[PDB]
Amino acid sequence: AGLAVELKQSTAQAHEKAEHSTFMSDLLKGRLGVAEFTRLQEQAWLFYTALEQAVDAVRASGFAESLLDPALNRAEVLARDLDKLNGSSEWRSRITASPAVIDYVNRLEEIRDNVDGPALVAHHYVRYLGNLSGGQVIARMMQRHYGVDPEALGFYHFEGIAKLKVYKDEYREKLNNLELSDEQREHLLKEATDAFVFNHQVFADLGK
Ligand code: HEM
């Protein structure tokens, strides 16, 4: 039972922990506010920027090309959302990576500079399949609990992909068809675990 399934199984426990961080739990249940959502999206712009440099490098190397669809790119969409949420472009010169984000960005830059395809695919799975798959729930809760304008929720929209359910199915088939060795597969799986570890610390730092 192939890679897509093994990824899901392998990270299922971490995914469930992710739903329950104090920050995310509090956010989704209405206990926070648009300001806290904006702080999250600012950190996310930082790590999606880094992620997408690593994706560009890996795609250019010819690994997992069809998986690494540039239509998934989130950083510029995020910046447009952040221009709406903050009311201006002034965030870019005020924002600072949290310590958790420094660690995560450093890993992403390591993957980039090593052109580590298997490692990159792990982080691509955790970031993009998560959004493609469940981001709509988060966006609905930001609208319903805090009145965020959907124009500021572009991050969750995948402009340019129509049929998201089919896209998800195809994304999994690409994972299943990747040519990996036993060593590349274990590295990818470990990395997907580490990805959830990084995300957990980002949320913890947001919650402080
Ligand atoms: C820590 C931030 C999160 C990350 C990195 C993340 C990651 C992911 C990933 C990788 C998937 C794909 C699982 C798979 O099918 O292989 C996924 C799916 C999903 N996530 Fe999240 N998730 C996060 C938080 C959340 C939250 C807070 C919710 C709200 C309940 C949520 C709801 C869902 C839903 C409904 C799916 C679709 C079913 C699935 O693909 O398994 N996620 N998420």
UniProtKB/Swiss-Prot annotation:
EC class (word): oxidoreductase
Catalytic activity: heme b + 3 reduced [NADPH--hemoprotein reductase] + 3 O2 = biliverdin IXalpha + CO + Fe(2+) + 3 oxidized [NADPH--hemoprotein reductase] + 3 H2O + H(+)
Alphabetically ordered keywords of this record: Heme, Iron, Metal-binding, Oxidoreductase
Binding-site list for heme b: H15
Iron listed as a keyword: yes
GO terms, molecular function: heme binding; heme oxygenase (decyclizing) activity; metal ion binding
SUPFAM superfamilies xrefs: Heme oxygenase-like
GO terms (BP aspect): heme catabolic process; heme oxidation; response to oxidative stress
PROSITE patterns, alphabetized: HEME_OXYGENASE
EC number: 1.14.14.18
Similarity comment: Belongs to the heme oxygenase family.
Functional summary from the UniProt entry: Allows the bacteria to use the host heme as an iron source. Involved in the oxidation of heme and subsequent release of iron from the heme moiety.
PANTHER family per record: HEME OXYGENASE
Name of this chain's protein: Heme oxygenase
Organism: Corynebacterium diphtheriae (strain ATCC 700971 / NCTC 13129 / Biotype gravis)
